[PDB]
Amino acid sequence: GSRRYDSRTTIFSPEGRLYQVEYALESISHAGTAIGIMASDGIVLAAERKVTSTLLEQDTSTEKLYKLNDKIAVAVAGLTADAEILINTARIHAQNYLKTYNEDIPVEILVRRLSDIKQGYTQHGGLRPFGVSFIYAGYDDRYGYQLYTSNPSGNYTGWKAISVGANTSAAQTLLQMDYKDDMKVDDAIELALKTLSKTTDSSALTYDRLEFATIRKGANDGEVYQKIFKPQEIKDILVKTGIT
Amino acid sequence: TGYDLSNSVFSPDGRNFQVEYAVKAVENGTTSIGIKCNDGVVFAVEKLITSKLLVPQKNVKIQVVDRHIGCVYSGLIPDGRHLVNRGREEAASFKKLYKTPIPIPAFADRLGQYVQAHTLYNSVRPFGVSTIFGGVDKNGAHLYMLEPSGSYWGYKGAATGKGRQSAKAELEKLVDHHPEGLSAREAVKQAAKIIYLAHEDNKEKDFELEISWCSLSETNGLHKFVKGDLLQEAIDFAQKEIN
Amino acid sequence: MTDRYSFSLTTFSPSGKLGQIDYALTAVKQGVTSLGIKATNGVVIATEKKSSSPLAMSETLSKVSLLTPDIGAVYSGMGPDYRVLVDKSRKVAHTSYKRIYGEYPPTKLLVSEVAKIMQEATQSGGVRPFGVSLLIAGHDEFNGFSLYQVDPSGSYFPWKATAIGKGSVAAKTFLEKRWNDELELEDAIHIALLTLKESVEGEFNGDTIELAIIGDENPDLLGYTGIPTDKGPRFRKLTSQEINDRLEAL
Amino acid sequence: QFNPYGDNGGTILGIAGEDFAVLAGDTRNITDYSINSRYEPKVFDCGDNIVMSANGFAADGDALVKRFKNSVKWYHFDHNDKKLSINSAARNIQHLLYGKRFFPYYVHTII
Amino acid sequence: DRGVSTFSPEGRLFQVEYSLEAIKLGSTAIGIATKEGVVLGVEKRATSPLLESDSIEKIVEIDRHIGCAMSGLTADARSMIEHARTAAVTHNLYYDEDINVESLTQSVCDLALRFGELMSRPFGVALLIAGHDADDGYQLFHAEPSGTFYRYNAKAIGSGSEGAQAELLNEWHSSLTLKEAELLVLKILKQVMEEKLDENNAQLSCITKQDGFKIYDNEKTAELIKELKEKEAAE
Amino acid sequence: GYDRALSIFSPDGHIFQVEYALEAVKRGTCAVGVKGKNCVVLGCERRSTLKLQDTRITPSKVSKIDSHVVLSFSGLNADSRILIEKARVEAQSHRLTLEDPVTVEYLTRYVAGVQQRYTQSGGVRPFGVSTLIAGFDPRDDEPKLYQTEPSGIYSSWSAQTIGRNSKTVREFLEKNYDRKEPPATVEECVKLTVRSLLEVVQTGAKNIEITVVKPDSDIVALSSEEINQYVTQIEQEKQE
Amino acid sequence: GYDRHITIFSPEGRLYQVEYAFKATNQTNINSLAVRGKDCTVVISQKKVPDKLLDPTTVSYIFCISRTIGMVVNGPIPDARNAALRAKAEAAEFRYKYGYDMPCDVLAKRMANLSQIYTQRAYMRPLGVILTFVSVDEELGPSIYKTDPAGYYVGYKATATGPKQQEITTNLENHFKKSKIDHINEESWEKVVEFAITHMIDALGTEFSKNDLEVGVATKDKFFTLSAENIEERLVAIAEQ
Amino acid sequence: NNYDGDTVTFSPTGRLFQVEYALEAIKQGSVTVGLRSNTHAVLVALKRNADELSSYQKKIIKCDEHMGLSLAGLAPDARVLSNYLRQQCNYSSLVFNRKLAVERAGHLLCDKAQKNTQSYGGRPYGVGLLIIGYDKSGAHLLEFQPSGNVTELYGTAIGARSQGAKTYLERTLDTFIKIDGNPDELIKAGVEAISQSLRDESLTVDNLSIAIVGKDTPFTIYDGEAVAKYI
Amino acid sequence: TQQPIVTGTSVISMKYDNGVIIAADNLGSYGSLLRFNGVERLIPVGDNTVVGISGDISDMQHIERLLKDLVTENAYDNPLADAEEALEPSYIFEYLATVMYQRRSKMNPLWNAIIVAGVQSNGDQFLRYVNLLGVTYSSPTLATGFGAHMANPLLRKVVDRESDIPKTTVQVAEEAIVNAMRVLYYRDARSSRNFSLAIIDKNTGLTFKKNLQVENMKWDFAKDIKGYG
Ligand SMILES: [Cl-]
Ligand SMILES: [Mg+2]
Known about the structure:
The structure is cut from a larger assembly and holds 9 protein chains of 9 kinds.
Chain A: H1 19-28, E1 34-39, E2 42-48, E3 65-67, E4 72-78, H2 80-101, H3 107-123, E5 132-140, E6 144-150, E7 156-159, E8 161-164, H4 168-178, H5 185-199, E9 210-216, E10 225-228, H6 231-240
Antiparallel strand pairs in A: 1-2, 1-8, 2-9, 3-4, 4-5, 5-6, 6-7, 9-10
Helix pairs in contact in A: 2-3, 4-5
Chain B: H1 17-28, E1 32-37, E2 40-48, E3 63-65, E4 69-75, H2 77-98, H3 104-117, E5 129-137, E6 140-146, E7 152-154, E8 157-160, H4 164-177, H5 184-198, E9 207-215, E10 223-225, H6 228-242
Antiparallel strand pairs in B: 1-2, 1-8, 2-9, 3-4, 4-5, 5-6, 6-7, 9-10
Helix pairs in contact in B: 2-3, 4-5, 5-6
Chain C: H1 19-30, E1 34-39, E2 42-48, E3 56-57, E4 65-68, E5 71-77, H2 79-101, H3 107-120, E6 132-140, E7 144-150, E8 156-158, E9 161-164, H4 168-178, H5 185-199, E10 209-214, E11 235-237, H6 240-248
Antiparallel strand pairs in C: 1-2, 1-9, 2-10, 4-5, 5-6, 6-7, 7-8, 10-11
Bound molecules: chloride ion and magnesium ion.
PDB class: hydrolase
Keywords: HYDROLASE-HYDROLASE INHIBITOR complex, Proteasome, Inhibitor, Binding Analysis, hydrolase
Entry title: Yeast 20S proteasome in complex with glidobactin-like natural product HB333
């Protein structure tokens, strides 16, 4: 019957590894690099679009950075379509929590939920896992500014600075060298761009190949603003930091 | 290769090898025949006597559907029974909704579609039987034969099982020598002969003859078994023709 | 019976490739060339009507399809897969949007819904991916004119202009030289016809070319008068004659 | 409106002696002011030296007795032909009756 | 691959036969039936000295009149015990009586072949079910993952079974006392065990009509081990 | 639904998927449990391959199941969350119906039962997780420490370790832990637990986590500096 | 090599099971032809009764789907009858839901969509048949729409299907190149059947008796099949000029 | 070979190997004999023990007051099929106040076994059954094979070494069919028949299992000292 | 739950020495309207059973189709369908009784009162009643509806207890039934003159009489009756 054709996507190897999770991670290593850096007064999310064209409409394009609610955003590395399925689930989960408790969802609770969904695809159902890694940048009034990552295994961890996608080994070494705890957002912007500029497989880092976003308490008084940077605003921050 | 390991897989020829393998089970079975006569149909079958311990006349092979349709088959006997059970459900639902008993061509397609459905998926096995069936309806007598593929046609005469080539030749003679037609009583006699002649392919063990018929004049369009004096008369006629 | 294929038929290979998606893209590569160009005041989508037999009436086969009054689609790859996607895309525009908000979806969100359907054929049990790439052109009040490509994986990208299928690599180079941000719709149609001539072997006329625009509102195609705010569809398929007129000024 | 119950009349009587027991019942079956039958047995031998009667609505009574007789049969199959003791039969009947707690068998039962 | 419910060319179910191999790897369990009671005994087999051995529960109560000992993948036994306890109690609810030991065993064994593509595989554990009822007296059954159960006057399962069963062949007679049976289990366990037998790495239990199913204290078993040592040194 | 039997027997009587789940446990960071006379301590390894981590928000290795019981683990992190959630739900369900918090044995038995179920259910793989469950039963001052594994077997331990290089730290505990006289104080128990991890860990900096559980829902996690003082005192005595 | 057993993509972007279903199409060794008149649509098909024991009246690959729609099949009879029953059901359901007779081209699309599903879903195999639907549609007039195992369909001026389709196709192509019109300019359906038979004779190079052919005719508001004697009258008229 | 992985696959010669492998489980099972006259029908079954401490596995199961069977092969499958027969016999009694005909009981067993041979996931039954009964058309004996094939017979045997008992019955056919109104002589003939299949071992008091059903005889099983009379 | 619409009135029956007799009129009433004058309410099953039905006619026609299907089903794989394994009255009754009780227990009854009359294999007379509630009973005489109140008293004067059955001939029994049918025509407002009568005898088999009429009616005394006081 049908058993003949079943790949068995949810089994252990003899070494105790999940084949499909490992191979999904291999897929993600070829995706554009995404970086998250957390500062005292905010969080930066930077990400490199993959080998673009001059005929791609950039100002209406979004492949890397997505808004989950007013306080939480994600950077994507992997299959964009897979990410959008999860993103829409996460957006609903945030709204379900808001409806129930009349408070914005804490960042970790949203991350745990999405990570649990990913975990399920590794343990049951016989389906392939999602080929997506997320960087979550968010704020709540318990822990303040938070950076997390999740990967196809459904495991998640918290970070002061982190990369996903291509050249994470090289990127994580550069971040580990220049990152300090008393760092500010403007410095973290510069660090994120300098790291991408050195790790990129492209010849030079330009505005048309980048997506950029900040989460600042640079919002008038006791509140948090999300800024998804426009193409012209990425061009300006590249000149300001001295990369172009 | 590997195209013959799973049902419903087209080979590079455009063939379903699993259906063709089911035909081999049919060819391995005992001989069964059908003859279309002037106002009805006659069915007959070869039953191999494996042992003296078999109770004579008890292990009945021919099956009635509704009250007007006979069914006989060669191959895997349980598969035939399963198909007849379905046929009985189909004939029951038809009569429930439409009042009239199911017409024979209508009934033929019901079996045909069901057998064909068992060539569409790898989760099921094809039927290991060719089924000869028919009876009398409002438009007269009808004889059908249905294969493992789901294929069926109407017949003047039909035969399947191990002695089918022998039987087919004998049936073809009857068609040529009787263009005007054959009477029901004649067809019972001829059916006996053809099974006896087809028994040369299964000559090791002796056998038991079993005949049934539906005729407008002789059975009022109902399916009945040939019994007693009329069965013995047909055996005597058959035994006289082989000697 | 029962569908006993409850498991994925698209899986990651050791190298991180999703085999079935790659193979679907190969099927798209073999397909006939289609393109899209965006102007300041419109969008054009075009493809060759590769007729399988001259006895076939190629007008009865529509490669360029209306999805909503302001959104159109064309494809390269497996035609039957496209046809069912158009049916599903038309329906999802109503069920998940018009029946809720009382208006047709914007181009980017309908694309998003089509993408979702294509993604699910890449992960759900007992199915293969769709063997098509779509080019979806459309207009909506707040986003203006737009053009999107959708691949077998479910990934989608916006384009100023692009081409998919057989001679896409050569066609995209041709479009890069001709495209600017000051093109009027007629200029974009002219460029579309020039680009498409390169990939066509045989006859090149209004009967062998299928071309549609997303442009001005067509009140003449609405079917009724009396409501000032309803001004008609922006999707219009060009006629055989309308194509041939622009082939003389070529 | 349809009334699923009825009253078939009748009277039954059980008396336990020192080493015996009797279960008696009249043989008259009725509806309203009519006699249906002058001899319709109401007390039944159910096997294992147990006698039973379910008096009231005769349809429900016949149903219950039939199901209990069946319960004795399956007790034998499931427990190596063990004799069903009277106390065990009594507990088994409670569950048969309570299984229809929200649409009861309209009868008074005596074994 | 191949079906889970597949027959071998010899007419055996592959998965059932393989589960029997898992039971051979399990720790030894012995049962002996007498007219004075049925004794059940097990090898605990702690993997490390830091493991608190009294938490090793390989002898288990099903009802007051039925005990059970296990050998093999003992985690698989938990749902079997749960079902047995439920069946015993449920029958008492329905019939105001104790359930027959055979009927209880049969109910457990009905689970065994409910696997396919229900649970995904057979149980990897064998059970010795011991008990008393009024009809057939003191009984000992051996419940397998095949769904088959045999009654036994005495039986050993687990890694030392064929050596123990040969010893039970010689030693069992129809006049054995309960005390004689307790020593006999201890003797045969001591024979087949890797480590030296004491009150912390072996456990005794019994079922009598009067007192029902009892797991023996470590102090009580310790005395019976000392009684065994002396009577073997006596000749 | 997906029904495929992933956990099955092999000709030699082994269930490979359960055994390969144990190999995932072997890969996981080391976890250790030691019970004193009036406490239980849970030690856990943190691999220092990951710096630039935010330790405030990163999932901690020891999880409270109720106010009186804790659970640590070795193996797949994502898998452990599913067991922790189920255990937490069952803990509140038990309070709701029995009007008493779970015993440590009951909670262990429940978690182990879940692990077992995933070894003979269609369409599912076993949990790649072994757990150490520790605490005190309600109104009881006797310490409790249990272990579970992917197969679903469970048992009680005076002291136990699981995960990578657990063979080494079990070796240490087997010679250093006396049953007749367990660590009488919190200090002695924490010291022996840190000592056992120092056989395997690398640096004694942010690589050791310690959680002390005392009777009557008294659970506290030690900080970096508090643990660093134990690390300092151990090596100064060792220089001799 | 399990990409050849089920309907998943091969490395070349191909569906081998679909391709092999196309090969099953010619297993009957029967050729069909369809043409359009002014007022009618005619479909002819070869009839072969190899066994003398067969009842020749029951041997048929032309089906009456609805009152207006007819269907000829090229492929094995079980799959043919499968498609037929379904098409009949779909046509009846359409009329019930939408209050008018299902158009030929809409039924073709529906059956084509069903065929598409078998090329995408693994558990269902394709049917090894090519379905040629014919009618005189109330909006579009004389109509020929043909469906295949890939889920492809299109309208036709005329068409041919079978082992020798190419010979018939080119014969028809050459005729329509001369006349420069999309149909047979003829008043009566009788003469359109005579055209269809004549051009099949020319293309195949074989003569036909009354029992060697099978004919279906679609007019306004009915589709019907010709008897052997109706065909005989047709053959007599051909031979007399 | 390549065609024995599951029950849904015919071999190139039209064989169903999983069914044939299930048939093999019967041949490994212990011998059991069935025979009948016009008045009575008898089952005789050689029970098998695991060892000298173990009991002898029961071979005969009662289905109704007028019907029952003996088994050879997988005993749990016999329990499943006999339970199904018990239910069908019972349905016939409760609904139609009618004792289920033995022939119709065979037909039901055939159809139940068939469904397991044509569907994916399942497996064939691994047991053969000899059903005896007395109904409105007198005494009956049936032989069930898990292929689905059910056969009505005067006498038969199944299990290991069953060919010896089957040959004996084939010789004795004319004698034992005439044993009317004498239950003891019919059992004697069954015990003498099963003796032709013994090697090394002989019929002891806890080895032998006999059942009988007849004209004024409910289906009853004899074990232990109740069969010492026939040893 | 429904209400009966088109209805059939009394069915009456009794035992006699060698068999049973059953009868019922040929009317289908639509309330007070005597709508359908050619309705057969005695339905034979084989040559040994007659099922007489009163109450809702649509439900009767359903039961008629169930019995027709029961004969068909019994003949399947049954070489003795016309002999030892033919349908018995007791089988046909029990089946109906099961259905009637099941249908009342789903609160969707077949709105009928049924009498199954026949002769068994061993020659024993069979006569038993079942209704919409699943209530069953047997008696030497049985009747439904008005018949219960008027026919039974007359029929019980012939066969009062079991011991009167061997003493009652078929001539005496038929006479009693025909007189009862006349009494019901005098006194039941929903009855008709035309009726059917069936005899099932252990020797002479099943005799089915159609188009019988109530005759020898006394009306002459009406001419003398004047006013109301
Ligand atoms: Cl559709
Ligand atoms: Mg398919």
